[PDB]
Amino acid sequence: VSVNNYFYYLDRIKKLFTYLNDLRKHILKKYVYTINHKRIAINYLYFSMVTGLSGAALATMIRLELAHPGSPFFKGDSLRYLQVVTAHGLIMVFFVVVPILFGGFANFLIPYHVGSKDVAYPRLNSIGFWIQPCGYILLAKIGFLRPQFWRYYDKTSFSFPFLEKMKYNQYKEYKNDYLFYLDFLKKEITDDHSFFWKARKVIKLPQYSVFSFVPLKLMMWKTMINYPESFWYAASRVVQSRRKKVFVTKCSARTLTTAGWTFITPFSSNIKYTGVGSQDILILSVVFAGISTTISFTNLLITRRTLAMPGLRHRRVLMPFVTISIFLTLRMLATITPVLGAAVIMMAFDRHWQTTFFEYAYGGDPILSQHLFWFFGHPEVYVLIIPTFGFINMIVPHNNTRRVASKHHMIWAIYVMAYMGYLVWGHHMYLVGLDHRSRTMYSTITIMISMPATIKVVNWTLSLVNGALKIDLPFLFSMSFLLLFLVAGFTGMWLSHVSLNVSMHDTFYVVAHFHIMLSGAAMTGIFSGIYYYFNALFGVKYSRMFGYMHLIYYSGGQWVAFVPLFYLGFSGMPRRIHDYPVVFMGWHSMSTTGHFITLVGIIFFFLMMFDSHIERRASTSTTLGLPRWYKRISYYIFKIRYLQHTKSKMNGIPGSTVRLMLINRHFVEYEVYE
Amino acid sequence: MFFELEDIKRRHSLYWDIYNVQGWVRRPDSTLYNNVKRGVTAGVVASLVQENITALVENCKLLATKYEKPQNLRQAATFMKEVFKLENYRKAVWNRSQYALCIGTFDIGARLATFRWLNNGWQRVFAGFEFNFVRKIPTTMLAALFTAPFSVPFELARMAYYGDKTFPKELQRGYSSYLSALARIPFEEGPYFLFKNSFPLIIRNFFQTFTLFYTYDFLKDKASFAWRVGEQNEYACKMIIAGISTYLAAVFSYPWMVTREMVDFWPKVPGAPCTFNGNYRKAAVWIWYHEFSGNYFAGFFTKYFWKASPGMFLTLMLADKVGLFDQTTVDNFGGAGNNSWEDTFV
Amino acid sequence: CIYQAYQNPLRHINTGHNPNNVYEDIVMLGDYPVQ
């Protein structure tokens, strides 16, 4: 019969609560404790997006600081500018590109491309995926957090008196000595358990023998009787004074700064030069990053050596270019990581134990630290730029339905470039003044490195030709990546000249070279691979209009921000400068505008992701299961299927004749009729 | 004190900064009356030109439907004279002049005044280009959204005034002029007829205004190097910028009218519900989801590009002449531009 | 597992492995299987 339960509302509430509990359990299972490679890669990609947003914000702040001569943004905080520059560099290099590329691409593809079940150590993969956030956060908080916490207008003098434990040292003597302790009780009170603030203002008050300069915020100790807060509340912004002078020193802690991406000794390797703070934080973050990189490299390389499929045991030519580049870069990272870790440990020991590991006085030499950093330096960039070439090569072959130009030659060239990258250490330290033989050897090795790159460019160009071009959004990104890589190679080759390098070492030319090589080529290739594999990663087809807008604004912004930088480099603008002469204002403003356009393009890409999520339409492989028409029957079948799918898709669209008639009769606004 | 909500007035202390010419400070010349007058003048001129061009084009189309295309230069001159001789063309000139006065008085001028009220404060760089290119991005979008539907009433009035003469005179409501129709029909059919599913017009106007304003501002700020590094005339540069902006606006705007026509002109399939269901917003969605983009761009040049793009170009040129694109620029290191003279000569 | 008994107690020595409000251990807190 009918049941009259008083609260169907409570029934529905119980249903909702059960839904919430089951949702929490399912979220913990498939998004927290999951060992799925796809889920781990998706999480890593989201974290990488967040980190890249933070890095782009740091870059935008740097660009705003450099926009106008006279330090309009940072207000002369040179230490803050240096910290922000180091933070941007580290977050983009060690926390954005490496995290995104390694985590996302490897986790998504190694299960598929290498054809292995999950990862070699799924527990380690999950551990690294969950561990990257700590370093991500740590490296991004240095610019806003400093040991000198008080503000420039913060009158720390009012509160620091309470921090002084030496004020009551006298009673410390009689704490364990009671024979004459009462004698100390016979003294006259002057500053015992009392605080007398000297007159902070010129008060001409004849009737007042004493003027209480005590903080008004601490008048009634009863209020402070239970407040579990420090006295800094009285010291935090209790004055209306402001010093809007660029000459006014806003730090007074000049030793507290950062030493950029490459730690430069002894400036970084001395407490007198680099105070306790950002330097130590960066060293610890580098140690953590090295541990995480070792973990990731073990998890990746262990599978490739062991978990290979029955047919992909040794013939690496069969694997995709992106996966081959992944394996090669993993080996390269496994090479230099121990050296980087040892160098970081030595730098930390010098900073905190004073081993004189960089002091020229009793045996040390900053050249050793510079050489170690460079031995970690050039291979890092070489490994970083490697995967994007494989991504572009994989994107191009499917779009043109043709075989690659020279797969074996390209693989061998990549391996040779990786081998050669271990011998360009002296190239980045040409001005350090090494032995002329060493400088000549370094220059000769640097010049010879371009031999593999030309092979790759020729192979890409040749594979792009004599094919069946099917233009997709991915193809335009690959073309943009190739165009960006064209200029960077020329800039690097020009910088390889000894005289030109001596004329432009550590300048805006080098800054432009580095940015166009990394920010342009690598990020463009990452975006291309994202668009090339948008379906498998997201499950829905991409949004054509917003994707085109992103590919347009992002490609233009890179050139817009790198052309003025190269122009200033030809004018000899020093790198890592907080301000410049007025002669550089035009180029600086152009670079800043380019950076803003790049930010707008990033916003457009985010809107593209949102639109793709709102679209919810299934994607169809343009190859239709036949990426190569290696046979006439295959070509005929592809043509027939394409014609059928076109006829089905072009259904309900008005016919050619009817559309022409309507278009011709469109104008229907006449004055007088018959 | 009067309603549930309250906007409490709170006093605050003053502020001081080193520089003072890099933010958004409303121009003293940016006043309501002056902005309204300049926008009205520019819009009226541009609308009059566009309407005269549209009338001439329609008369030429009618003549071509009546007589063969000219065979020589002399034949072209004769055909042009014959077309110009049309009393239908004269009546169209009068009606389009009325409609153009109405539209450029209320749509182009309104959009220009809104842009002036929204982009008055953004000062430029003393020795370069405006690096804060995203500062006015929200201002331009909001300003375009403000005046996006201002022209739909006049457009609907014109369409109805030219749409009733096609029906028999037994159902003719008069409409001696465009102004007469605009005066009578609102008191006859109700305002809702002039604002019934005007989404295509609203979207087209919004997109056109946003494209024109943003592109013109970005080009004027960024391309100054072409008039600074290179010693160009900058007048051909202004004209080229106007042309590029007009082409971009047309490309970004024609899809709304294309969707409206597809909803209202595609032959309906017997025995099925309407694919767009008669809202046409899905049409835009279909336009935003169509696989063949060109399918939503057919006849773009033929249908409306030759009728409104010249108006937009003329409006941009007239705005440049009226100086409505003026953005302040002061030396960030000299005199009024700074408050700390120490870090300027040492 | 609040108000929905997904888990069965007879197969679980220590009921309460997940946050739930519709379960109770068969072995009571004052229960003791003795010989």
Next chain:
Amino acid sequence: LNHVQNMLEENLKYDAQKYNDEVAVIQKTSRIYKPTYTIEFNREGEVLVYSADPIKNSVVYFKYPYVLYEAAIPLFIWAWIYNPLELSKNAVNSLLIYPNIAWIPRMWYWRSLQYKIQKMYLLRGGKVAKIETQSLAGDRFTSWVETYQFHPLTQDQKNFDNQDNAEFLEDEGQLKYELGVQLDNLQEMGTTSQDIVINFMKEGTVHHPELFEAIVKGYNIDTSDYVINTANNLRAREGNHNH
């Protein structure tokens, strides 16, 4: 937007509906011609009708319209170089515009040369005609077109000639003039283009002329009496006197 009414719009909608309902893809044919000779189609079931080498019969290097601009470019080059008028830098740059555009007429003429039907064949069934041409870069492009797509033009080419009763050939079969014919839609390289005018030159040879006239008239031919020629005398991309 449908709230406003226009009787022109209503008539247009009614006409569109009528066209979509009545005008169908399947259409009956009436212009049918029965030839006066049994036709011996080639090994590929084709009978040749017109063979021509217009490139061999064209003035390529020294053309009428292109020569004037091609020579006048040096005058503008000299004027810009010597600054004879003593103008400004911007005026000189403007004067430099002329040389950058001179290639357009020559390119247009060369492209126009490609549209000439070098070879014409009729396949079995008398419904599709294969027209083969060669782009001046030596690009041999062939296309099959429907029989109904042809419409003759006048000898003056200023007005569309009547689809029937046209006399564009001599009595013996040779063409009376260099003829132009319009095709509504031609699928060149798979891409359909609308309203394209092709030309058959008088220098061509009208093999089996009668059917050619039927191809010119556009009427469908009754391919009843057909023989097969077993002679693979044509090679893959065989060299031709037209080059």
Next chain:
Amino acid sequence: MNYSYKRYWEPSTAEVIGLSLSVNTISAALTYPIEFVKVRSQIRTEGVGIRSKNLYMGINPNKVFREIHATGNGLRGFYQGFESHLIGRLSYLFIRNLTYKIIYDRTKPVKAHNDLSHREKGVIAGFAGGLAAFLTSPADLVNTRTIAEGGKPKEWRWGYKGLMDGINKIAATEGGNAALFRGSYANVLRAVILNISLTGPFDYLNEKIWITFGDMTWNKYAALLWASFWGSVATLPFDNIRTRLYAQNADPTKNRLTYSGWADAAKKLIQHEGISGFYVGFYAFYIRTFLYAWTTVFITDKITSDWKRKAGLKEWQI
């Protein structure tokens, strides 16, 4: 921020009453169709709720307005509810304003830079609004009974020709003025929620904008928009419940679901529509509230600025 206030000059009670009357009349006239549509929408899905998924969810205010216009009365049919709702709005505003003015006169801090705290001001405003809305429950029911007859069957229609005729019919058929207070507690709760969901967020956003963007001109409008959104989110279930209650016709067979009170109405809505049933027409309600707030704020602020300038307060004091 406690001493940050700026109340150097104070308005008089009569001028405040007159300005409130004029501005509220203008704002209600502007928002009359919006309120009528929002009331009509809530009757349409009183037992169906939002059955659409993801972005399709909610009731299309554009579609509702299109249907209302196509009903045949056109734009002229958008003031039938406004005929009586205006008087009730004016009465509620007058009562709340008198109570709040008396309270503020009896408890204002001496310093013009010092005002009653957020909690105290909210309490006073909530008391005034609750009293005022408890006063005008009959007017709310009468105005609601007019618009509700359109989406309801003609047999189930109540048949009110306006304010006085509707009042007489209600006092006759429904038993008496006791039925006039059906849902009076709901109206009081709606006003109280409205009385406290605006000033807090408005002041918070205004101060945040002042700190982040200086004393810019967009601060007032941005704070108004944020406060309107927050107040609409807060009071949305209360307004829906009050409408569904005051709309309850006498004939039980003529009611889709029977509501014996706020608890019964909420239980039935949760059983049928669920939690999302309280978010019906949220966009339309927010639009109406924001429009009324913008009109009233602009008019009253302009009038007050003119009055203060006449009074001669300093440029910083104005």
Next chain:
Amino acid sequence: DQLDFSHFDKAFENKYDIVAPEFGDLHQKRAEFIAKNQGTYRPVPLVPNNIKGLIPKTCRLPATRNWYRRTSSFERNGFFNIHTPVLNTKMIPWLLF
């Protein structure tokens, strides 16, 4: 009866009465005539029939009389093709500059 979602009941009907025309009786009569004469009564704009110096238009002329070669073309399947041989030819010039 009510609250029985298995079969819909008239109590759930939300239908607004259609009182009068939305735009007016003139619009109603015009709509009636249009639905009655759609494709039947075809008014034509007034044009002077005799025009000295202008040969009357009698039929469609061949494409050789056009004053401008359009780029976009119409594929008979209903497509609006931009990539055409004429498009390639026109794109060859500017790319050279």
Next chain:
Amino acid sequence: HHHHEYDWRDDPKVNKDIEEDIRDRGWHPETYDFPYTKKHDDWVFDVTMPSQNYQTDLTVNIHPENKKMHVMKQVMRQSYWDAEHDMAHEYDYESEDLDFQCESFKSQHFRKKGPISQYLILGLLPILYFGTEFFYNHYPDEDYWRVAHPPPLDYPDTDDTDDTETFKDYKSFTGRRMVDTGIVDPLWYDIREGKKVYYDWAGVNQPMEDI
């Protein structure tokens, strides 16, 4: 498996409050199964190519330009997850189930889409985060984003701003001579009463008052 009972409010044809997604007219994702096995496309003719055999019909001509209208076939909308059933499918009965894979291919965890509002945040994430680093955090300084207003007259002191003294420097002949030299630009403001009125030519708004 299995499903619920009949409800007229759940039928879009009955309930008038259901808005039909024009991009999802012919597709009903609720009918999609894992793995999908519904055929939805085959060889279709008689749209532009007649299905009859007119290969050698001299009396029949095919006119591809006169194709009749057809029904638009919307693309397959992405599947929406039936969370409840999925919550049952992915549920775990701990310490009573062996860690083995069910033989059925239906046991494969097919990732189906759900609500979209979360991704909406990803649309505004680049903006919000930016504000988080610039507005909420007030980096690099509080005044960097504040409205620009110059300091008042002799505020905070004549050492930092001796504007009145500047007026004296602008009143002497030598400074006047400097103006004649053109090297020093004209005065940036004028001292009116005790206030500094910046002329409209200065391009800077009026200095904030001392409240």
